[PDB]
């Protein structure tokens, strides 16, 4: 890809757990440590935006198929896609979306989906940046520099980072039981 | 004549400057409907059992 000013700091903070800073990571066949930590970083990004958060689940989004091909294209960018209400009828098949109830593939009109789109290490909150850096540091610890005590402290500190980031999500987007949901909004109409 | 009108319009609870009447059940409607919901669930929650 392209260098990012925050992402090099992330790959540096992965190697802040073990050893020395690399520089700028902009070569494929390169420093093996930098590309290796960068692969761990993008995997923890793809996993940490996978779980579903209230700033990530773009709620009523509409996808549109190609005009010639008549087929809307599932992507690896499309991280996990579900339907709006319940009993979600959309699944990936070939690289294309597919109805498991209509038993069909071609779509005439658009489609309304709760989708998650893959974002970078940038475009995330700082809570989640610290959580991806610390969980990827735990993974990079466990897979290459196998030392026990630094694994214990990164496990404890991942738990603290997830504590903070669940505090962020229960603070981002105030969810109230009796005045905001779909069931007991109506029960309290006088 | 003015007093012996055979069409008698009857209101239950009158209000000023208002051509019609409002029922007596209206005034206790909400605690009525709050019963409804609160009771509804119970029957539904029974059926799960």
């Amino acid at each position: 890809n392209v260098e990012t000013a925050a992402e090099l700091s992330a790959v540096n903070d992965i190697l802040a757990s073990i050893g020395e800073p690399p520089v700028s990571t902009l070569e494929g066949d390169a420093n093996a440590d930098a590309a290796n930590a960068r692969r761990i970083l993008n995997k923890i990004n793809r996993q940490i935006q996978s779980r579903g958060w209230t700033f990530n689940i773009e709620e009523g989004i509409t996808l549109l198929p190609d005009v010639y091909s008549n087929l809307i294209v599932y992507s690896d960018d499309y991280l996990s896609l579900m339907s709006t209400s319940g009993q979600s009828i959309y699944v990936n098949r070939g690289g294309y979306v597919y109805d498991r109830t209509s038993q069909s593939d071609r779509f005439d009109s658009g489609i309304t989906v709760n989708i998650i789109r893959l974002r970078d290490y940038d475009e995330m909150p700082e809570c989640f940046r610290y959580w991806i850096v610390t969980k990827a540091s735990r993974q990079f610890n466990n897979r290459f520099f196998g030392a026990p005590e630094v694994e214990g402290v990164l496990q404890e500190e991942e738990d603290e980072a997830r504590r903070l980031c669940m505090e962020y999500e229960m603070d981002y987007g105030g969810y109230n039981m009796l005045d905001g949901d779909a069931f007991t909004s109506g029960l309290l109409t006088r | 004549p003015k007093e012996a009108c055979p069409y008698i319009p009857i209101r239950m609870v009158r209000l000023d400057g208002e051509s019609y009447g409002r029922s007596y059940i209206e005034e206790y409607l909400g605690d009525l409907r709050s019963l409804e919901n609160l009771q509804e669930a119970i029957v539904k929650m029974s059926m799960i059992s």
Side-chain angles (χ1 to χ4, degrees), chain A residues 15-190:
Chain A
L15 274 306
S17 178
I18 303 97
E20 294 178 354
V23 172
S24 293
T25 65
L26 193 63
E27 184 67 28
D29 187 74
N31 205 166
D33 200 355
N36 203 349
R38 187 172 181 270
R39 178 167 290 160
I40 294 298
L41 197 279
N42 285 321
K43 190 185 77 174
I44 299 301
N45 197 1
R46 188 177 293 270
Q47 189 271 124
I48 216 71
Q49 293 179 356
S50 179
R51 302 186 185 185
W53 305 101
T54 69
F55 71 102
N56 208 169
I57 300 170
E58 296 176 353
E59 286 179 354
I61 203 164
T62 60
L63 299 176
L64 294 173
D66 292 332
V67 178
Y68 294 106
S69 178
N70 207 169
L71 184 57
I72 173 65
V73 176
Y74 190 90
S75 68
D76 190 74
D77 195 1
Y78 292 159
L79 213 285
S80 70
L81 69 91
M82 295 181 287
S83 178
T84 62
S85 67
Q87 190 59 254
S88 56
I89 56 170
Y90 297 138
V91 73
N92 45 3
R93 179 182 181 271
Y96 293 138
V97 308
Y98 181 71
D99 297 338
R100 64 180 176 89
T101 60
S102 178
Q103 200 65 255
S104 68
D105 198 3
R106 306 292 183 184
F107 287 170
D108 289 330
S109 178
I111 177 178
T112 61
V113 173
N114 298 120
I115 207 160
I116 297 171
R117 296 177 183 270
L118 188 274
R119 298 178 186 173
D120 296 331
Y121 175 77
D122 196 73
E123 304 173 355
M124 293 293 286
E126 183 63 34
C127 180
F128 289 97
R129 290 181 183 179
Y130 188 73
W131 183 35
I132 175 187
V133 167
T134 56
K135 188 176 177 63
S137 179
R138 182 181 177 182
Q139 293 285 321
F140 185 76
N141 203 171
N142 285 304
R143 295 184 188 183
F144 294 102
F145 186 79
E149 295 179 355
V150 58
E151 167 57 28
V153 70
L154 287 177
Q155 186 267 332
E156 182 179 1
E157 195 264 331
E158 181 189 0
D159 286 332
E160 183 177 1
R162 186 182 181 272
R163 181 187 66 82
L164 291 176
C165 230
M166 282 292 292
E167 287 180 353
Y168 178 80
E169 183 264 330
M170 289 183 285
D171 202 1
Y172 188 91
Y175 286 159
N176 47 2
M177 295 180 288
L178 58 94
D179 286 326
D181 57 352
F183 184 72
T184 178
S185 176
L187 272 72
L188 273 76
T189 298
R190 306 289 281 193

